Amino acid sequence: PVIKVRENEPFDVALRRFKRSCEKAGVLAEVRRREFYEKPTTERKRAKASAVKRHAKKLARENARRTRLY
Amino acid sequence: RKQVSDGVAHIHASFNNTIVTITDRQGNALGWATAGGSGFRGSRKSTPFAAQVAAERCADAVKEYGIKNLEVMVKGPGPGRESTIRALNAAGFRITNITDVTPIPHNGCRPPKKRRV
Amino acid sequence: PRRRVIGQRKILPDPKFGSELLAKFVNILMVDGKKSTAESIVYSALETLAQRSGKSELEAFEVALENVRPTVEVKSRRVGGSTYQVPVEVRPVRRNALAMRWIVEAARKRGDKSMALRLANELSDAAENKGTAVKKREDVHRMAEANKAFA
Amino acid sequence: SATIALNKRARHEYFIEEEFEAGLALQGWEVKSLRAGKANISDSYVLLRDGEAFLFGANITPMAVASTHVVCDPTRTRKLLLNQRELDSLYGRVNREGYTVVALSLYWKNAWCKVKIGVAKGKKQHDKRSDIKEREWQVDKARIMKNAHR
Amino acid sequence: KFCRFTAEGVQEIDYKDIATLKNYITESGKIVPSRITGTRAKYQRQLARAIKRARYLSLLPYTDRHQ
RNA sequence: AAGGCGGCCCCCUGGACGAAGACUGACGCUCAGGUGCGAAAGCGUGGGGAGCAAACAGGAUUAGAUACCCUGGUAGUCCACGCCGUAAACGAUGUCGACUUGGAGGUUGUGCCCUUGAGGCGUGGCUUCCGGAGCUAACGCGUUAAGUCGACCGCCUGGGGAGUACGGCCGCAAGGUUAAAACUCAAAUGAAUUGACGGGGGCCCGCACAAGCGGUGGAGCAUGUGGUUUAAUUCGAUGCAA
Numbered sequence A: 001p002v003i004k005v006r007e008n009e010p011f012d013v014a015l016r017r018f019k020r021s022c023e024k025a026g027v028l029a030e031v032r033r034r035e036f037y038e039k040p041t042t043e044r045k046r047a048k049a050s051a052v053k054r055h056a057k058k059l060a061r062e063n064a065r066r067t068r069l070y
Numbered sequence B: 001r002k003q004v005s006d007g008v009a010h011i012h013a014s015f016n017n018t019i020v021t022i023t024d025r026q027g028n029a030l031g032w033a034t035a036g037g038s039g040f041r042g043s044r045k046s047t048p049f050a051a052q053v054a055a056e057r058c059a060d061a062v063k064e065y066g067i068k069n070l071e072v073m074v075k076g077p078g079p080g081r082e083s084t085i086r087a088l089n090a091a092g093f094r095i096t097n098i099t100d101v102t103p104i105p106h107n108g109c110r111p112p113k114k115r116r117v
Numbered sequence C: 001p002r003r004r005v006i007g008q009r010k011i012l013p014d015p016k017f018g019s020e021l022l023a024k025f026v027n028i029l030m031v032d033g034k035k036s037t038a039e040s041i042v043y044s045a046l047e048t049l050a051q052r053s054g055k056s057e058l059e060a061f062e063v064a065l066e067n068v069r070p071t072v073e074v075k076s077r078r079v080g081g082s083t084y085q086v087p088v089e090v091r092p093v094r095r096n097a098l099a100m101r102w103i104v105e106a107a108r109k110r111g112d113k114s115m116a117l118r119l120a121n122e123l124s125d126a127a128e129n130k131g132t133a134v135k136k137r138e139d140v141h142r143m144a145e146a147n148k149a150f151a
Numbered sequence D: 001s002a003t004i005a006l007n008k009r010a011r012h013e014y015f016i017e018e019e020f021e022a023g024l025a026l027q028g029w030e031v032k033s034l035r036a037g038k039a040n041i042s043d044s045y046v047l048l049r050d051g052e053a054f055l056f057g058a059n060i061t062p063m064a065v066a067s068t069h070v071v072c073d074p075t076r077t078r079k080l081l082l083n084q085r086e087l088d089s090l091y092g093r094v095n096r097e098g099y100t101v102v103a104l105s106l107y108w109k110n111a112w113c114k115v116k117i118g119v120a121k122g123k124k125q126h127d128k129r130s131d132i133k134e135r136e137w138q139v140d141k142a143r144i145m146k147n148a149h150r
Numbered sequence E: 001k002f003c004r005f006t007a008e009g010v011q012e013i014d015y016k017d018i019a020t021l022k023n024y025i026t027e028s029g030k031i032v033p034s035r036i037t038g039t040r041a042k043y044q045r046q047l048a049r050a051i052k053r054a055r056y057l058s059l060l061p062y063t064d065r066h067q
Numbered sequence F: 001a002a003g004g005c006g007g008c009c010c011c012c013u014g015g016a017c018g019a020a021g022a023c024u025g026a027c028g029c030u031c032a033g034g035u036g037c038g039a040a041a042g043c044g045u046g047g048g049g050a051g052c053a054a055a056c057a058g059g060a061u062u063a064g065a066u067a068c069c070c071u072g073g074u075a076g077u078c079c080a081c082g083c084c085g086u087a088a089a090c091g092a093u094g095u096c097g098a099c100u101u102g103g104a105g106g107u108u109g110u111g112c113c114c115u116u117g118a119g120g121c122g123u124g125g126c127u128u129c130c131g132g133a134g135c136u137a138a139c140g141c142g143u144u145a146a147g148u149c150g151a152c153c154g155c156c157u158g159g160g161g162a163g164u165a166c167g168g169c170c171g172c173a174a175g176g177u178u179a180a181a182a183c184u185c186a187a188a189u190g191a192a193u194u195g196a197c198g199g200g201g202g203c204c205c206g207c208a209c210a211a212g213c214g215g216u217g218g219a220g221c222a223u224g225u226g227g228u229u230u231a232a233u234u235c236g237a238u239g240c241a242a
């Protein structure tokens, strides 16, 4: 991403904008999974393990609204 | 030598080392510095402080050219991705553009196997 | 204490002139329950410093403390046996306390005819940023600001 | 360099506390075999009688029978030359519950053979587990710290 | 949000449209996921094909950097 | 159908689902023997080979490491034509038909109402999570049942021996398939519970750390301890907790 800083802009805010752009692009987070070979078996296992937790959280959110006042 | 008004600083960072190099506008290196040569050995050169030391050494190594308008290009998931840039800024060099071009294979060559540590 | 979080205790108003700063200076300068002679020494030194600097005693003490006032504490929050310290900003109360502790410690460090004379001589240097307090502040600040990549 | 048959198994099998650089006393045909001649230092321990802490377990192969008068005994108890000042540790801290001192290695010191001795004790297969666990755990802690701090 | 294609009754999506299609690509040339766009699974699979057609025909860059 | 399939385009083509219809008229289900497909690995011929990577070499750890950590690295992984029918080929749940409370979704089509906004009511196919009766040894299934029945095939009869040998067939081979007997034992197992353990995790607490402030290891001396000497150096206390 091009983060060419214009005039009258502090280096601090310029670097923060660059870091935010990198974070929203998610380039740094992709190397931690592209650094090694994940077998298709392992990838599918991770995907289902993440899907199971992803609606289990919503299931618990919608189920904890019945009892347990505080 | 012949002084250049504009420059591009490439910061190739990695998990174990960080290299910073300078070119004018086309990819012709002028000065380079590494954390290994910055007085650090082993994993001790992987700290962002070592990256800052390497960046300031590279800035000192390019004093004879006097670059005023610099554009920084980061590459690699290293701790120095911000330390090198801030060191370059603090060394008196003005930054004009900031970019992070990192090689992202589109499901290309197969990476090595998982390490069972 | 993990759960019991207490506040800050109150000290005597230092009825010599009346100042919490002076009371804290006295109760940190005193040792072995010798508050009487500690007060005599510190008051003699401050009265000499008043004429030596031309200003009031309290104002001259406050500005001398401010001129050697530090800003960063270098604590040891390392995760284990590995050496990993951390500098942090200091709250104003602990800042003043540490500054006056450094002053009274330099008083013991530099020797002379009497502790009153040592205190007077060291305050006459902290007035124009000399002695030991400012040197210690600089020596702590250089190593507290040279390590910025470590958070 | 000048190293000869050593017993590194006993280092893992025991807790070496202190070491002695005392020498060994051996007869003919054996010191020559130390150069070449297949000396083996397995099952080595001291056999204190009164002040005579002989090394009992050692098999040095005799390479010749050209002197066919003296009977060859590869399992001979070899005498040991140690200062009486430092021999107090051996008549002292040996017979408490299981303390032993074993021959860790044997080397050369200016054409004279020196056998390194060491005071140690057994592990009962539970100290070995703890040692291996700690050796692995320090490595794992260093690795995880390095990975976390990138 | 809501599927604007269904809201406006857009039956088909053509790669030739760029002004109203740039809204579905990030600044890095990546496709905005459905969980952020608010688009149905019927039209996400057609938006992806249109974006791929535009990338092939140099109408929308694959990424910010190419050379 | 299963195995399994992921930029885009072009050509051929199989299969699946829906409103409203028209049409033959039991043409329907299963199926030993047989036929075909069928992960990867493997084999033969002809190609290619960027990266990865059995075997192999070197380096490192360890008492030892013919391994896990690292640098290289051939077969192979990439293509065409041939051989095997092997997987935890799993949903450990065979194929087809009917019935049995409900809730919250995903995907796909259609009908209607004023569609001003994915406004509202219906209606079929696939699929996901809870959950009632019921079932089960219990975990658990629960309209896609492991609930009640109907039609058929295959398989099971203690754990080892053993899916082994022989025998027949298949295959260039590796091996696959069909499949025992002698001998040993009184056990071999699965679901769940209580403790215990983990180099599993989370939370909490105590001058436990941090923060401070004083001390002990440096030096006279004091009793006390172990060892030594001695006639005895009188008994016990021997990590915190002597």
Ligand SMILES: [Mg+2]
Binding pocket: none
């Ligand atoms: Mg293959």
Ligand SMILES: [Mg+2]
Binding pocket: none
């Ligand atoms: Mg390898």
Ligand SMILES: [Mg+2]
Binding pocket: none
């Ligand atoms: Mg090796």
Ligand SMILES: [Mg+2]
Binding pocket: none
């Ligand atoms: Mg099966």
Ligand SMILES: [Mg+2]
Binding pocket: F095
């Ligand atoms: Mg059939």
Ligand SMILES: [Mg+2]
Binding pocket: F130, F131, F142
């Ligand atoms: Mg259920």
Ligand SMILES: [Mg+2]
Binding pocket: none
């Ligand atoms: Mg067989």
